[PDB]
Design the sequence.
């Protein structure tokens, strides 16, 4: 009836009146590898901390948070689990096979909790089974990812081996020509970590704009005439548009596009730039609705629903300790 | 009727074609290979005959000399004056060259300046231009750049989301390659269709050992899959294409790969060869798969998905699609790959005609389809000769 959501130099918490969702136990785990295709009742501790081998600075913090927290069932909820329905063609990188079979390098995806939440939130609003829709959902925040949901399963998503890749984000470059990296090492003697910092901490909106990691900040610099900030927002939109384009291709069409996250739920600019000239899909926004961020913002003529859904990952975590620990 | 020669000088290669212009008739073609190395071979073919001689070819200066004396000694040319212009393929023109250039003194220094970015090719490409200008002083020469075609891309398409300094100080951006090929089949499509290219939204798929896809809208490249170097974009023969950049620091921090080994992992050990473990030739991977090799079959399916994904990006960029072009050794011949690539595109009115695709006909789309799907043999030497005759013989 009353469950709590833990997210471990930090310890976010939130207790909810379940199942009404009323309100600042289940445990957010950053990487479940391939072992956890779903949220797991908690031995589970020891294969959580083992996969720390691929989520070093997040996995053991979360699994020690599970230990600190008796007689209360705990469910571990893995940001990666939603994406374990991807086929090999979606998660195998064209590297030498041994890099996957002996080192576990493959696309994994993250934000799986939020994508799962908002996609079925969307289905409930339309009154149809999620499996009846072809959905692209964009979680757009400090981190950003796109996700393609078809027949109720995630079939692709933009973050790869680590949460650094995919679309452009606040400080993460997203995907870039990989051959840039051996060039940077041989021209600026960048160490493995400096490269890693370059990609994770000074790229994206921050590196392009020179102003800020924050969309709202960059958007003010660009309206006051800053050219690098204006370009930044443009490239931001384009990265996400190209990714959406891949996923529509993969699914053979599109029934609904979902925006969420700090930018997705609030930025009328981001959403209008991202949806520009898509009449060939039957997608168009309505200015008035887009502007007040109504739940559905598509034009009445439009064939593709466009939804602005606020993601609530603690409430989604709640609904899983209720399902696997007190059924 | 002019006699134009197209030249492509590799690090140890010297490919060449002699064309009768402006018809396009091929008089002779050939390759000098293993230059400097032992095993140096010279092959020369015309319509009728073929000549091949293993013999010591020291430097490129000696490859060019055997080429010129063979043209007269095989009765191909009556004299070397008969040659009206030489066009040279050049790997990387950076931002300086938006088009093919008549070879100046300035053109050649500007080309060696860009060696910074195409180190294994640009220096030797310029070597070819110099040797020919010495050995054929009277003949005009034109540089044709693999990037030039993509110089019509906008910032939001060639800027990588790195710190600005990385572009404004080290020139790191998407350049794109295969310009000459995409240019050529773009424009061939518009001829064979009787429409002007300004009127079409085209996606062009050069699928060979290297593979790239290119979005042409209103007559211009507006995006292309290869970025900073020809390693990136879709999956290829032994090139990985685009992967997660964070894999690279991981592998350096974990396996200790130098900058050079990362380049070889990405360029020579990945792709079709990396995934199938079989080979880098699409045909040999395909034989392996139909024999039951699951990795080979996986490799052919990943290859198709990576190309579908890029097409998807560019179709969205242009607001639709009017024609899809398949070229290169795989695009031109593999009805299977074209089929796997075009499946379930009813959302764009795109559908293939099986009988036409099996024959590799010129248009393979289905009868009720809204999108034209063309199978066009790329012909970069022809594209080069046309640029030589545009800029070196304006009459
Ligand atoms: N009203 C707004 N208008 C525009 N952008 C906004 C607005 N509010 C927040 N943002 C942006 O969205 C970000 C907040 O995203 P948020 O979803 O809270 O991130 P997060 O979930 O805490 N971290 P992550 O899970 O990695 O995305 C801010 O840093 C701003 O860039
Ligand atoms: N009949 C065929 N069916 C399928 N694949 C084929 C066929 N013939 C050739 N290929 C493939 O075509 C590939 C390369 O063709 P080609 O385009 O000539 O290479 P290339 O021009 O030397 N390098 P590049 O132009 O950069 O792609 C080979 O690696 C084969 O896998
Ligand atoms: Na679905
Ligand atoms: Na992403
Ligand atoms: Na990106
Ligand atoms: Na499809
Ligand atoms: Na050359
Ligand atoms: Na450009
Ligand atoms: Na270019
Ligand atoms: Na390219
Ligand atoms: Na070009
Ligand atoms: Na162009
Ligand atoms: Na490519
Ligand atoms: Na790739
Ligand atoms: Na568009
Ligand atoms: Na379809």
Sequence:
């Amino acid at each position: 009836y009353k469950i709590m959501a833990i997210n471990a130099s930090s310890l976010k918490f939130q207790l909810l009146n379940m199942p009404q969702g009323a309100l600042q136990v289940g445990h957010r785990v950053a990487h479940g590898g391939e072992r956890f295709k779903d949220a797991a009742l908690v031995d589970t501790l020891r294969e959580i901390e083992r996969l720390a081998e691929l989520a070093p600075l997040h996995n053991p913090v979360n699994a020690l948070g599970i230990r600190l927290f008796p007689a209360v069932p705990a469910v571990a909820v893995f940001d990666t689990a939603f994406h374990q329905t991807l086929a090999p063609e979606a998660w195998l990188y064209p590297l030498p096979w041994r890099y996957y079979a002996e080192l576990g390098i493959r696309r994994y995806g993250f934000h799986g909790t939020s994508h799962h939440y908002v996609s079925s939130a969307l289905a409930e609003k339309l009154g149809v089974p999620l499996s009846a829709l072809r959905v692209v959902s964009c979680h757009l925040g400090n981190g950003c990812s796109v996700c393609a949901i078809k027949g109720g399963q995630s079939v692709n998503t933009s973050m790869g081996f680590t949460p650094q890749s995919g679309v452009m984000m606040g400080t993460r470059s997203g995907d870039i020509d990989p051959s840039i990296l051996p060039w940077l090492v041989e021209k600026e003697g960048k160490s493995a970590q400096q490269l890693s910092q370059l990609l994770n901490n000074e790229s994206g909106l921050l590196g392009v704009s020179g102003v800020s990691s924050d969309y709202r900040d960059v958007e003010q610099a660009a309206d006051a005439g800053n050219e690098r900030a204006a370009l930044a927002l443009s490239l931001f939109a384009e990265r996400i548009r190209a990714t959406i384009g891949s996923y529509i291709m993969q699914m053979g069409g599109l029934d609904a596009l979902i925006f969420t996250g700090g930018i997705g739920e609030n930025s009328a600019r981001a959403r209008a730039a991202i949806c520009r000239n898509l009449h060939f899909l039957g997608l168009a926004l309505d200015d008035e609705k887009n502007q007040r961020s109504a739940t559905f913002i598509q034009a009445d003529n439009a064939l593709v629903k466009v939804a602005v859904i606020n993601t609530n990952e603690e409430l989604m975590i709640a609904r899983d300790v209720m399902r696997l620990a007190l059924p």
Remarks:
- The first helix of chain B runs from residue 60 to 73.
- Chain B touches chain A through 76 residues (CB under 8 Å).
